[PDB]
Each structure stands twice: as structure tokens, then as C-alpha cells.
Amino acid sequence: KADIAWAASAEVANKPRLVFVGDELRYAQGANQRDVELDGFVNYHWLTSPGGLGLPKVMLEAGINAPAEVVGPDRSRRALIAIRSSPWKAGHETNPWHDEFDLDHGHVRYFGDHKPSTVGLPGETKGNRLLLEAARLHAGTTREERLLAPPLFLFRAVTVHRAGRAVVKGHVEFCGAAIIERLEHVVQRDPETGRSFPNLSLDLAVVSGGEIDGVDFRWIDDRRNAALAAGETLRHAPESWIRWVRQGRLAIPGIRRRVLASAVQSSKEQQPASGSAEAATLQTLYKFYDGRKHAFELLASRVAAEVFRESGARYKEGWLSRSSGDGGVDFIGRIDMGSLKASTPVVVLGQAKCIQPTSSVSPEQVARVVARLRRGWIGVYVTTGSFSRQAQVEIIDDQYPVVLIAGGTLAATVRRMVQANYGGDLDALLASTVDEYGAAVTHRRPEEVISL
Amino acid sequence: IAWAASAEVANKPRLVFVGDELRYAQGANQRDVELDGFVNYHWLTSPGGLGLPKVMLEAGINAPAEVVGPDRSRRALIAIRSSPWKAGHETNPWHDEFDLDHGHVRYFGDHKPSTVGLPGETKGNRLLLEAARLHAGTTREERLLAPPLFLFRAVTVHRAGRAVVKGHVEFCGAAIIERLEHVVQRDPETGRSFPNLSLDLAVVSGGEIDGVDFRWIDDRRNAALAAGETLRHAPESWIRWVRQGRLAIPGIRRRVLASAVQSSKEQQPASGSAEAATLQTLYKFYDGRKHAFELLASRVAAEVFRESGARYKEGWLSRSSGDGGVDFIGRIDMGSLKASTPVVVLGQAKCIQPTSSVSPEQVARVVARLRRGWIGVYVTTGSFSRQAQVEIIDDQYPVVLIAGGTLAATVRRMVQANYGGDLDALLASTVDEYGAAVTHRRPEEVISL
Amino acid sequence: DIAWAASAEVANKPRLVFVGDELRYAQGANQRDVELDGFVNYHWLTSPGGLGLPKVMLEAGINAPAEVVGPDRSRRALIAIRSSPWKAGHETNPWHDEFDLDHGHVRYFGDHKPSTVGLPGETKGNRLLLEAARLHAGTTREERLLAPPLFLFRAVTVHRAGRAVVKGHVEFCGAAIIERLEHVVQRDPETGRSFPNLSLDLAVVSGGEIDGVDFRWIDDRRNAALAAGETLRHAPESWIRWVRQGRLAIPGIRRRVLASAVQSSKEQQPASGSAEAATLQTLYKFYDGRKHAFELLASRVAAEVFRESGARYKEGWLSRSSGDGGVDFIGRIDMGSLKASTPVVVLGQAKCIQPTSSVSPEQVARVVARLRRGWIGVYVTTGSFSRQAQVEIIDDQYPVVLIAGGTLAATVRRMVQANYGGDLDALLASTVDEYGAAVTHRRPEEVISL
Amino acid sequence: KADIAWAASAEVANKPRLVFVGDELRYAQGANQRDVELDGFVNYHWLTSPGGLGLPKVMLEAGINAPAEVVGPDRSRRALIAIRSSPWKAGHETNPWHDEFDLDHGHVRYFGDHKPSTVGLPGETKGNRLLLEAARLHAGTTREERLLAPPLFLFRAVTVHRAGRAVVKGHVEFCGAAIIERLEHVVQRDPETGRSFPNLSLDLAVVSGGEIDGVDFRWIDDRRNAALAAGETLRHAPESWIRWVRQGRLAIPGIRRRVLASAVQSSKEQQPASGSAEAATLQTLYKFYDGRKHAFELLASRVAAEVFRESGARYKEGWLSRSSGDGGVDFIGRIDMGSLKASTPVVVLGQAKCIQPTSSVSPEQVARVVARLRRGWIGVYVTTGSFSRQAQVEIIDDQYPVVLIAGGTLAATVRRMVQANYGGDLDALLASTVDEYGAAVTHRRPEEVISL
Numbered sequence A, D: 001k002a003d004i005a006w007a008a009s010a011e012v013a014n015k016p017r018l019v020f021v022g023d024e025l026r027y028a029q030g031a032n033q034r035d036v037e038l039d040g041f042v043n044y045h046w047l048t049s050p051g052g053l054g055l056p057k058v059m060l061e062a063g064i065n066a067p068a069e070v071v072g073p074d075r076s077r078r079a080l081i082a083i084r085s086s087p088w089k090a091g092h093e094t095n096p097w098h099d100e101f102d103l104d105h106g107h108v109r110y111f112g113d114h115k116p117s118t119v120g121l122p123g124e125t126k127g128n129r130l131l132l133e134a135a136r137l138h139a140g141t142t143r144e145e146r147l148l149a150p151p152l153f154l155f156r157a158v159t160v161h162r163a164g165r166a167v168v169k170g171h172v173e174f175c176g177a178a179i180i181e182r183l184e185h186v187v188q189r190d191p192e193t194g195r196s197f198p199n200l201s202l203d204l205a206v207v208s209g210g211e212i213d214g215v216d217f218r219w220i221d222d223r224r225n226a227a228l229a230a231g232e233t234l235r236h237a238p239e240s241w242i243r244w245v246r247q248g249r250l251a252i253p254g255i256r257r258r259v260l261a262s263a264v265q266s267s268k269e270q271q272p273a274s275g276s277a278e279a280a281t282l283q284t285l286y287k288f289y290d291g292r293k294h295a296f297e298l299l300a301s302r303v304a305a306e307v308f309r310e311s312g313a314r315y316k317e318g319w320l321s322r323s324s325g326d327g328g329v330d331f332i333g334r335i336d337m338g339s340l341k342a343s344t345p346v347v348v349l350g351q352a353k354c355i356q357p358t359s360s361v362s363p364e365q366v367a368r369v370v371a372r373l374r375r376g377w378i379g380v381y382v383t384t385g386s387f388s389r390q391a392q393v394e395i396i397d398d399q400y401p402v403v404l405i406a407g408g409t410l411a412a413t414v415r416r417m418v419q420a421n422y423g424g425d426l427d428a429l430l431a432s433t434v435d436e437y438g439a440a441v442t443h444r445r446p447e448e449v450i451s452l
Numbered sequence B: 001i002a003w004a005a006s007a008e009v010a011n012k013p014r015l016v017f018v019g020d021e022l023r024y025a026q027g028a029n030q031r032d033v034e035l036d037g038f039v040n041y042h043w044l045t046s047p048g049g050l051g052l053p054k055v056m057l058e059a060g061i062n063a064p065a066e067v068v069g070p071d072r073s074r075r076a077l078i079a080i081r082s083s084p085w086k087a088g089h090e091t092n093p094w095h096d097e098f099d100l101d102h103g104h105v106r107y108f109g110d111h112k113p114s115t116v117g118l119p120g121e122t123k124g125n126r127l128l129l130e131a132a133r134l135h136a137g138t139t140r141e142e143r144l145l146a147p148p149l150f151l152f153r154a155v156t157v158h159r160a161g162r163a164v165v166k167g168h169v170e171f172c173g174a175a176i177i178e179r180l181e182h183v184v185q186r187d188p189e190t191g192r193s194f195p196n197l198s199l200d201l202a203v204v205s206g207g208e209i210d211g212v213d214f215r216w217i218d219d220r221r222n223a224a225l226a227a228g229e230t231l232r233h234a235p236e237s238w239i240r241w242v243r244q245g246r247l248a249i250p251g252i253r254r255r256v257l258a259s260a261v262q263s264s265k266e267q268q269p270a271s272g273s274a275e276a277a278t279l280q281t282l283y284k285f286y287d288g289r290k291h292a293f294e295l296l297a298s299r300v301a302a303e304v305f306r307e308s309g310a311r312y313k314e315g316w317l318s319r320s321s322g323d324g325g326v327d328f329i330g331r332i333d334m335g336s337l338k339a340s341t342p343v344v345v346l347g348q349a350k351c352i353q354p355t356s357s358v359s360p361e362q363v364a365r366v367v368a369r370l371r372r373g374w375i376g377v378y379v380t381t382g383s384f385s386r387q388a389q390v391e392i393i394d395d396q397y398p399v400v401l402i403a404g405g406t407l408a409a410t411v412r413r414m415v416q417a418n419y420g421g422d423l424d425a426l427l428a429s430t431v432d433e434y435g436a437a438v439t440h441r442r443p444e445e446v447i448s449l
Numbered sequence C: 001d002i003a004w005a006a007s008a009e010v011a012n013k014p015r016l017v018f019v020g021d022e023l024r025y026a027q028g029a030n031q032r033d034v035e036l037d038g039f040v041n042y043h044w045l046t047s048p049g050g051l052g053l054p055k056v057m058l059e060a061g062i063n064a065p066a067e068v069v070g071p072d073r074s075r076r077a078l079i080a081i082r083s084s085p086w087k088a089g090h091e092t093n094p095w096h097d098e099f100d101l102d103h104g105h106v107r108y109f110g111d112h113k114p115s116t117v118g119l120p121g122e123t124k125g126n127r128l129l130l131e132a133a134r135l136h137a138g139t140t141r142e143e144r145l146l147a148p149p150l151f152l153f154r155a156v157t158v159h160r161a162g163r164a165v166v167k168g169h170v171e172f173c174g175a176a177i178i179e180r181l182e183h184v185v186q187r188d189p190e191t192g193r194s195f196p197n198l199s200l201d202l203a204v205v206s207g208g209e210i211d212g213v214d215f216r217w218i219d220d221r222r223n224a225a226l227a228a229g230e231t232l233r234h235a236p237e238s239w240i241r242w243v244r245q246g247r248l249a250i251p252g253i254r255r256r257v258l259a260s261a262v263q264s265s266k267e268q269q270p271a272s273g274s275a276e277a278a279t280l281q282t283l284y285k286f287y288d289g290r291k292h293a294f295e296l297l298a299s300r301v302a303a304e305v306f307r308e309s310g311a312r313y314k315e316g317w318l319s320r321s322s323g324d325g326g327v328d329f330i331g332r333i334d335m336g337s338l339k340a341s342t343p344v345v346v347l348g349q350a351k352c353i354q355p356t357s358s359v360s361p362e363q364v365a366r367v368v369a370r371l372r373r374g375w376i377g378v379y380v381t382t383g384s385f386s387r388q389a390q391v392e393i394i395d396d397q398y399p400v401v402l403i404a405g406g407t408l409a410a411t412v413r414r415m416v417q418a419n420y421g422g423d424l425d426a427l428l429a430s431t432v433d434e435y436g437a438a439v440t441h442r443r444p445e446e447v448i449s450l
């Protein structure tokens, strides 16, 4: 009876049990601990506590959860804290005290479980007590305290579909492990009685799984192990959390989870391939348009036009704002979105800047264009050089409606315009943009492109 | 040819469209029409042969001599000339404000820091006061004498082939003085403050033609003609003003929309079309099925956006809000492949009788939700009210409109061009095979997937 | 030394009271009983018998114990204030105390009476308020240490044994710092007298870990053997922070209660039979036919509402003299330094509907849609705003100020009582005769030139 | 005898004495009331009280002045109140609570005559008593009370030079007629003696002259005319004033004097004048925050707060976006626009930039802040330097809702903050920003400031 129960624990201790952010789990009431996948999804109780360990379940009810206080040769320890929130609304805001999940930037604001009927002060409820006691450890200035600091695992109630219909109850979503970076006392007004009650407000920093966005659940097996030390649990623990226990609060901005919407391109993958014809072509473009910026602005307008038409959308070229000097906007255009005789106008603000293909564009120069954009307006930045990482990061993060055109796209679109209606001769378009054509500035308001 | 030439001038209409670029040269001929690729200004104001000198148009306020008639004396007209622009450096808070699309222009008088005394000691402002007194109105006989104000702005042009900066102007309609004020301006050169005049002006609607018949000027410069005899080549707007007064101003001002307003008939399918029948069946089906009609709306809007080559990608709905109306979310990839930028598409739907129209506020509920980088789309079985379209165009609301006509048209080719069946399966699809696809996600998350 | 046991008990036992606590207030009650008639004894909580100190009287208005003489200075321990809001719609006085405890803001008026001779304030209350204001704006931490905390109390109607009972009970509303004190001129609707008085903006500080205070703070402040710097050991963290930093602490120490900003139709409308209700009736019955005169009135009302804060508001124009459209009127709010400030274009919409009717989210959205970047909106109505409209304004974060029946009626009451001497019909006539003249056809952006 | 006198008074009553805003008047206490021109300038005493009237002088001593109560048949009334503002330091102000003139916007911030050694509440002094008795009528509840209201005529001591020789004393200038828009309690501290004292602060609304940029002094003659009733004294009053008498509070935001002037300031104008105490303060600021970025961000948060408080808006302290590194947004606040009952939250984005006081902020740097602004949001840029002219014109043209705080504004605001809270001790403030910039940093989204 001992050899078997031990060999099973060793068996589950050998195999890794990974979870990932977004993983739909099946949280069933009275579920076993053997079924690896219940009802199509990975079973919760098995993932958190396999049957091989011989350990009881880690309940995940609405609010704050925690298993028994782990007593050990190390010290008294809290294994972990399991958090669960809802999304179904039935109110006015619905809540001024609603839990906010910013997983893309690794930050979650979560509110305590103090009820208006709770007789006492935060936190007489088990949940808030666990939260305070853990907060004291997360605010630890030593490794001896941060080792004891129980990991807060996040879960989110999700609606899961199958073949037909949608199941709202019975499923959860792993959101990650987090550090308690701030705790506050708040006052929430219960609308049922119109009476104010106190509560807790946690600012949490979600740590990123290295190298892939996930967590090995054997770490929890380590935490729950009453025969282990606090330092003996950092074997299957993510490197970020380890770096937190090793460093402190100063490691937070470096280990905090970070997810962008779209991909970011380096200067090398924005510029054409080294040695290719497009490289020498871009160099000749930088050499030719170094003296005159305006012809480069006209070129940029035409290029932008061909780029917007490349997708399929109907584009209408407007004009060029300036004839001398510099400004925030260099050229104006318009995009008719939809079908013919029903399409809606979208003003296209354009900025062009000729620069070394090795050089990159600063985010403030892009922002000088973004700032002029009103509702229903989009932008386009045309350059010979590349775009800095922070530029694209700020664009993606803040959801900036700006089309980026670096060396590569410029070279390709121009090369397509050299073959289409230029007849191979590039100096034809190059010189045509220099004289005659460059005199047309129109000099009108940007929103007046709609009228024509 | 003495009076016969002047009578020959009174036969040929000299219509001057609002926006016509004119050639203004120092010592320009009054006989030659076209000058340097442009219509000569001096000939336009004074054709020569009328026995009348050319109406000068120097910087700011101009006016010809007083006109002596058979009864009473009248001022012919007032010729204004401005000059934009400062090449990306608008400097004056006392700059003239031109809103021709709504027939409104605010113009500032020509008092100068050097000018001693109060406005208008200066000739221009003096003329402005004198005219404004008549523009006040009260009686129709008093409005009858009020001199029209013709507006011009110096526009940099292109002489046949290459650009020319100075020596060219641009017509800007005829205006009524609706407000006179005294303002104080600080001269940047000196730093000291000087008084001046500020004028709110209503540019009247031309009527059949946006421009005006310049023979009106000739009639007003005609000494033999009386005041009430000068209103024959004048726009009906000005006549309505002389009749009524300051009350007729809202209904006579120039009104220009960037686009055209469609009627209910053209927003609906042809009266005898099969698509009209399918539309009627659509309405009869989704009368009490809002959610299904909204999923359908998501699909239809998706196919409409797709029917252009534009890289469109669908998403979800939003029936979670909290007693809030349902809206579908989509996303468009803007520009070429790789060189692309996401755009969130927020759409709403309303199944109404094909005869019924959508109010401006209902569309505005979609417009309001739009953050920068978003576009809206409204889908309905009925039509769209005039005022809604007006507000969308005028205020430049980025919202795509799909009436019953476009709806039925796109739906008709959305089934028997891919389904391999009929409309019934789709009507059942939006109910059963669609179900709940709203989720609890913000519209911004569609660009993150 | 024998009573020093009870005194030590008092000094050692934390005596907490929370914002919203119901206290039994009886003048003849003793300071030894902790409970009286079902509720906590006010006089015990404020001045326990173990201290042997006199009672802290809570007369209606402004109260303060005799000056406390310390080894260093002579300080006023505290200033107890008892307001009496009483009514759901309000009383008859246009200048009544209003509470925004969910945001730690209280508009409170001085005790200057119509029958008061001289300048504000020859009355003891206003005098105490000014003497307190001398310290609440202390130029040093030492001065701020002497500053008497304002303890707000507020008469209420508790639900006891005999099917609820009015009077005899007060409500603790927190400890306050005087943000602002200005000269105001009020008018008694009944007597007809116009008199000066003091208008005070008060900041109810955040309690921190608890939503209230420890009255041992008051015990320390009343202790004549303690220096002012020795009395902060039981004071709120927000208060200590204020004493240290001064005015720089106020924006971050106000009490905040996370509560639904959505209001019902009953809250937005006056009481069933209040003065504001009759005012609203006169307004609706008057402006039922003509919408433009009401647009003018709404312009004035929006102006007053924005000017309450002390903001730099400048009127613009009225859009249309006939017909209907998206925006009814235009104004502006200069924000920043007097030398270099940025203007905020204000877009207004007026709609006179049945006071029982509500404004739809689409009707609000017609206004919100017109808002450019840097622009703010305002919607004025005789009716209310639907729940969903407010929900969408909160959700999608619409920069729009909502002025419904109650706010309109109250504001109009103040305007009438302070400019036309209680003559509503004069104001109405002025709106009818002057609306046509206050109309321009300018773009909203042109308001910056004003 | 009687013929000449009565004809003199009649000829004064039938002749408009127009005085414009900015006019320089010769003021001699021993001058006569006959000469209309004294020492190359207009005689003050003649202008304010012509000899033909036979009325006593309207003395203009330093501070607040008022003639004897006019015993009219309607009742007793005050003719007017003549304010004289002592200084123009041209930037060399040492007292933070000096009177501020903004005549281009018809606003004047004025301060009472309460002295540090004054015993009693404001105002036991004659001046403050005059201002309070006046304010009683300026906020008159009826048209008649407003008819009784004595107009405030503002005068500022000026240095004149008509021959090429500057004369510091002896001459004053007209600054229009004003309405007491606001009268509030305030506490000042004389930096000299170091003594703090209470006083009155006033927001004055200089009214629009209408057709003329000034007033006709026959209005004053009529108010001083004891034979005239109060209602009969408006015959030569400005239209704005009559409109105020009729309407009341509702007229004020529409009758303020307005002067159209360029909002663009030079680098010299955005900086405190050289040789001033304020310039020394700015020097100390730049020198102290030359290496500190985030401390300067905290300080900038505080300063922004104070400026918004000056505007009258209710500001709410939010947080700092980061404790380390750089970014677009440094600090976040909130403004509850409207009244207590009816209001809306306005998110405030802030950016700090401790550059050289001679260095100017580029359009791209400002636009990096503007680009982050949604609707219902406002921005604010705080710098030790100035803003480039191009940045300013880009702000004005596209109407960017951003508050500009350059070196001068910053320094002045800091001087007032220090004098009013730390007893003139700047080190306390600086150390406060250095020691508290770490615990003010949160990783929340700017929209979360509505919950604070």
C-alpha cells in the first residue's frame, strides 16, 4: 500500500504538466483526479492535483481560494492562492469595482471578497485574510520572505461552445501567475441596501512564462509538498518568478508579461535583402532624392496610392500640402470604403522623409503625423530608411491607424511602377517628379479631398 | 456704337461660378476676356463699352463711386479681396474665416495701428458701416438700397503650364451683412492695441447656378436705373431678402454638401424586382428576430466590404453590454500585404419596414462609439432619412450605409452564388446555425487576434 | 489616580466611527453610556466620561469647544458641523448644503442670517470658519498642525421599533479640510431679504484602512497637555499627509466610494411636492411650445453649472433661431494659466420634454458624435435620462454633462433668487424676447476667438 | 458768476470724455482740475473730476480708493471705487501673490489691503471693507441693487518716456471698468518678513467697451450727481454694464473684454526675465532636476494640479506611469468638469521634460503627447525650457487640447507653492519629489483614473 502510493507520486513527479494562458479547462463539481481530459477539455482537478500525489483537491470557487497551511521543516507556508472571477453583467456600469484584466501588458486589478453583510473589518473573510497575509510576503524585502510568498494563480470564467449552443458554466481559463505589487482599501456601495462596505483592491503584475507563455504545474506540487523547503520549490518554477525572488520589486518591469497585437519588424526585415538589386536600387533612391525632398513627396504619394490599390480598395490621390520647407503633413489622399455609389470617404494624411536605409524613424516624428489625424482619418509614413522598434510598438499598442512604408515596400512598389506604365526607364518617373509635376500643390484643406 | 454696345453687354449673361480663378493684372484690359489662361477680372466686373470704369480690387475693401438714380442715390457694390496662405503658418486670430459650404464668412475690417481715431476713419470700415446700416433692414425700401458684397481671395495658380503666385483671385459668392461688431486687435509689429470692425456675413444661394449674373452689377452701376429696377439679374435669394428681411436669411444661404443625398426610392430595390420580394420576405421574417437579423447584418456587411478586394476579416457581436443594443465587430487590413494596418469595424442593425427610414440619432449611436481608427456600418431593411445622410456627409462621419436595396441586392447574390441552395436555409442559419457569437470582448480585441 | 484607570481605558481603547454611522443625539444624555435608545450615544463617542471633559455640543450649524491652551499654543480642537438636508427634493432655500461623499466633496454654507447686521461674519459660526480657514491654508506644517479638523454630522431618519422615527439621530459624514472659501450673496425666498454669507468647498479626507476615524484623535486635540505635533498619532494617514505636504495632498486624499454613477428617474427629478417640482412644472408648461427660448435658458443654465466649480467659462451662441438640428448652443471653457490656456469647445443640446419622459441613448449620441478632440458636451432637459443612456455614457466614456429636471430646476431657482429677486416670469420673458438676437452661424471652433 | 458756473457744468455734461484702455495719464496729487493736459500727458484730476462740475478730487492713492457716499434722492450710493496697482516688475516679481493682469481676456486677479500686522479678520482694513460692501452689490439679487453697485475703475502705475527719458513715478494707466466676478478668502506670506496672513482674493471681469475700447467719464459724473437717481445714471454707461445691471450673473461670461492677439510666445516670453528671483528659481529647478527625470515628473504632476486649481477645475491626483525608463506619458490625472451634482470625468495626460531653459520643445515632442489623446481627454506639457514656435503653431492650428507650461509658468507656480505650503523652503519640496516618486508609480491604464 505504501510502495504503490509512493511510486505513483514519483510517477507524476517525473512527467511535466504544462498549462498555458488561454487554456480552457473543465471545472466540474465532484470531478475525479484521473481523467486527463474531461468533456473535451483538460480537467481542472487533475491538472492542479493529480491522483498520484494522494493529495486533496484545490477548490476553485468564486473569489479567493487556498489549500491548507503547509507545515514543514522549512516553515509554515501557503502553497498558492487560486483566483476566480466572472464576466456576466447585471448592473449600471456594470461595476465601478469590476475586475480588470490587462494581460497584454501584464496587469490585473482585482477586488476582494468583502460582502456588505460581512460583520467585521477587511479582512474577517477568509479570502481577504489570505490576501493580506500573502501581501505581507509579496512586499518582502528579503529572499526569505519572497520564497514564502504564495503564487497567485489566475482563472477566468469563460463561455465554451461545442457543436451547437454555448455553455456558460463549467469552464475556466488560465490567466497566469502574478505578483502582488499593490494593495489598497476601498469603499464600495452596495445598491441592494444602498449601504457602503469596505473591501480590498489588488494591483497585480502578471509574470511571463519563459520562454513560452505557460506554467509547469509541478511547481504547485512543490509548493504543496510538506517535505520540501521554500528554496526547494524553484525547480519547475518559471525563470521570471525565480528572478523576482532573487531580486525584488525592481525586477518587475523586466519580468512583467508582454503581448503585442501584431508582429514587430526589425530594420533588417524591413529593408530589402543585403546585396539584392533592391538594395542598390534603394541606395540610388537615397542618392537621387537627397537634394530634393518634394519630388520624393510626390513619389511617396504615388507609392502610397499603388499600395492602397494593391489590396484592392479604390484610392483617390489628392495633392501635396507644401511647396517649400517642412511640416507635419506632406501629401493628402482619399480612400472610398465599401461598394461603388455607396462607398464612404476616408481622408489619408501622408508624410514622407528620405533618410539613410540604415537609419530608423523616431516615434515622435510619426506622432507628429498621428496628432493631425481626426476621426475617420488614416495616415501613411513613407521613408527610405527603417522604422524603430519603439515606433511600431507604440503604433500597435495604442492602435494607431498608420500605414508604414520602409525601404522594402518602397523598393517593391516602385519596381512594380517601373514595369507597369514606365517602360523600364526609372529616370522617366524620377525626372517627371522633379519638374512640371512638382509644381502642383493645390493648397487646400485636408478634409476638402472629400468634395472631389 | 455708343449705347448699342452697352445694350449688347446687357444681353450676354456673365455668370461667375463660385471658385472661378480670375486673372488680376495691374492695368489689365477691360475688353479682353481671357488673360494668361484665366478670365480677366476687370472685363468681368466692367466689360468696357458700358462707359463705366473698372471696379478696382486692391488688397482689402474696394468700391466704385456713388450711383445717382432717378430717385434716391445708391452704392453699387463692395469688392472684398483677401490673401491666403502663410505656407503652413497661420498667424492671425483676426484672420478671415471662410465656410462657404454653409454660406458663412467672417471678415475683419481694415483699421490699422497707424490709423488715428475710431473705425471707420479708414475708408473701408466707413463703407462697411454705411452698408451695414442698410443691411439692417426694417423696411423693404431700405433693404432695396443695400449694396451687395462680392468676395474674392487671392489664390496662387498655374499660368498655362507653370505656377504664378500673385496677380490672381477667386470668386466667393455674394453676401449679406448679418452682423457688425467692434473688436480690438493687437498689432504684432508695434505691440499696441487698435480698434477695428468684425463682420459676420451670409453668402446667399445662387439658385439655378451657384455663381451670380454680373449684369446685376451693371444694372446697379446704371445711373438711369432705379433701385427696384436693378433686381433682374440678381439671385432669387437676394430678392427674397429684400422682400422679407433678416428673417429670410437661414433659407437663402449657400448650402453645399460634399456628397449627394439619396431618396427612399433609390435606397430600395426596383418596385417590380425579385430582390424587392426577397427583401419583403426578409422584413417579414426578421420582424421579431433582432439577434438573427444582426448576425445576418454582420455577414452582409462583411460581403459588401469584401466586394471590393479589400482584405476584410469578421469577428463577433456585442449582446452583452447590459440591456444595450447589439453590435457586430469586424476588422479590415489596410494597404498591401505585410504593409498593413488593422481597422476596427463597429456595426449596428435595425430591421424596419422598407418604407420606413432611419433617424439621425440612431446612426449617431454608432458614430459616437467610434474611436480613432474605427469605422462604422449600419444595416437596415428600410431607408435612411435625409437629415441622417446630411449629418453624416457634413460632419464627415465615417459610417457605411446599407439600405434595403443594397441589403437585398447583396443577399440575393450571397446565396445562389455559393450556397447551392436558397434563402430559407440562410434564414434558418441566422437563427439556429448562428446562435450566440457575441462574447464578452471589447471591439479593440479584434485587431489583437 | 483612581479615575486614571477609566481614563487609561479611554486612552487605550480605539474608539472608531465610520462615515454613515447613525448616532443617537440627546442633549440631556450622559457621557458614560455607550448606547442610548437603540443607537450609539453621541456624547459618549465624542467625549467619554472617562476623560472628564465637557460635552461637544452639536447644535444645528457650526459648533466648536472653547479654545484649548497647550504648553506651546492655543488651538481649537475641532469644529463640529450639523447639516440638515432633510428632503429628497430639497427645502425652499436655493443655497442648501450638498454632499458628494462618494467623491469626498461637500458644498457647505455659512450661518449668516437675513437678520444679521454687518459683514460676514459677525456671527460666531462664520467667525470660527474664517479662523479655521486661516489654519487650513497654513503656509507651514506648524500652522497646519493647529488647524481644527471639521467633523461633519447630518440629521437623519432611522428605522427603529415604532415603524421608523425622525429626529434625535445624526449621521457621521467624515473629517473635512477647507478647500475653498468665497463670498456669496443669498436671498431668503420667504422674508425676501438679500444677505451676504460664506460658500465653502470642503474635502472629506480618505480614512485609509478604515472608512472613518478614531475619536481618540479628538481626545488628543482636546488634551491641553499635548503639543499640536503630538496629536497625530490617532489621525488618518490622509490628514498627516496633508499636514506634511499642505495643499499638494488634497487631490489625492479625498474620500472615494466606488458606486454606480447611474441614477434613477426619481433621483434626477424633484420631490413629489417640492418647490423645485413646481418650478419644473412652470418651466415645462412654459417652454412646451417654443424650444428655442428654452435653448437660450439652457445655455444660461449650462453656464451656471460650469461656473459653480469656479471654472473659466465663456458663452458663445445659439446655433439656430428656427428649426431643429444636432447642436442647440455653443460655449467655451478656458483651461490653464491666464497667460497660456487651452480652450475647450462646449457643445450644447436642449430638449424640453415631459418631466416624466426620458432621454434616449441615441438622442445623447447625436450630440456626442459631434464632439471633436478636446471638445466637451452638455445635455439639458426638463425630463430625465434613460438608464441605458447613462450606461453608454459611462461605458464608452462620453464627455457629456447631464442636466435633468432636478438640477435644471434647482439651478434656475438659484438664478432667479440671485438675479431677479424671485421673479421667474421675468426670466422666462427674457428668454422669449432675446433668443432670436443671440444666434450666429459660426462654426464651433470659432468660439476660441471670443 | 452763476452764469459761467452753470454753463461750465452744462458744457461738461454735454461733452463726452472718452478714456481708452492703455491710456497714460499724468497723476499729481497737487494738480488742478482745469488743465486737461499736464506735463505732456492728460491730467488725471481733470479727467476724473472736471473743474466745471465743482466736485472734489477723486484721489488715486496706492491701493483702494473711494469718494464720499453720494446722497441721492433715490437713496445713498457709492459713486465708484478706484484701484491703483503698484507694480510692473517685468518678470522681477518676488511676491507670489501680486495682482495679475489679463486684459486681453478681460480678467484681473486682484488682492486686498490686509497687512501682516493687521489685527482681525479680512477685512478690518478700510480697503477690504470697501471691497466687501461693493461685492454685496456686485452680486445684487435685483436690478436695483445692481443699479446701486459702484463700478471698479482699474489703474496701473506705469513708467513713461515721451522725450527719451523714463519716468518711474507720477504716471498711471487705465485698465477698464471691472465687475467683481469672485471674492474668496486667501492666505499669503510676505517673503520679506516671513509672516503669513489672511487676505481677500478677487477675480475681476473687465467689461467690453462695445463700440469704443474704453469708457465715457460722464457716467462717473452722473453716478456722483446727487440730483440723479441710480437708474438715471446709466445714460452714459457702456452697453455691457447696462446688460449686466439687467441680467446679472448671466451676463458676465459674455461681456468680458476681448483683445485678439497672437497666442504664440517667443522663447524670451516663455522664460522669466533675467535678473529676477523667478529666474533664479528656474535655475535651481533645472540644476536640481538635470539628472532626475521621474522626480521631475512627480513635480510636474503637482504643478499641473496647481495650475488646474488656478483655472477653477477640480483636479484629482492620479499616478506616474513608470519609475524607470522613458515613454510617451509620464503622469496621469483627472478633472471633474461641471458642478457637484452634474459633472463628467476628463482624463489628463502629462509629460515632463527637464531640458535647457534656452532649449525649445520640438513639435514632434509635443505631438508625442498629443497623439495619445482620446476625446474627453486633455494633455499637459511641463518643461524647464520653452516651446518651439512651430510646436505652438501646430498646437493652435489643429486645435490640440494641450496645456503648455514652460519655464516661466513653472517657476512662478513653484514659487507660490513653496511660499504657501513650506514656508519658503524649496529644499523640502525638492526632497519631497525625490523621496516620493517611487511609491506614486502604478501600471494601470489612464482610463482607470475615473475610479479614483
Ligand SMILES: [Mg+2]
Residues within 6 Å of the ligand: C325, C327, C328, C349, C350, C351
Ligand atoms: Mg435641440
Ligand SMILES: [Mg+2]
Residues within 6 Å of the ligand: D297, D330, D351, D352, D353
Ligand atoms: Mg518625461
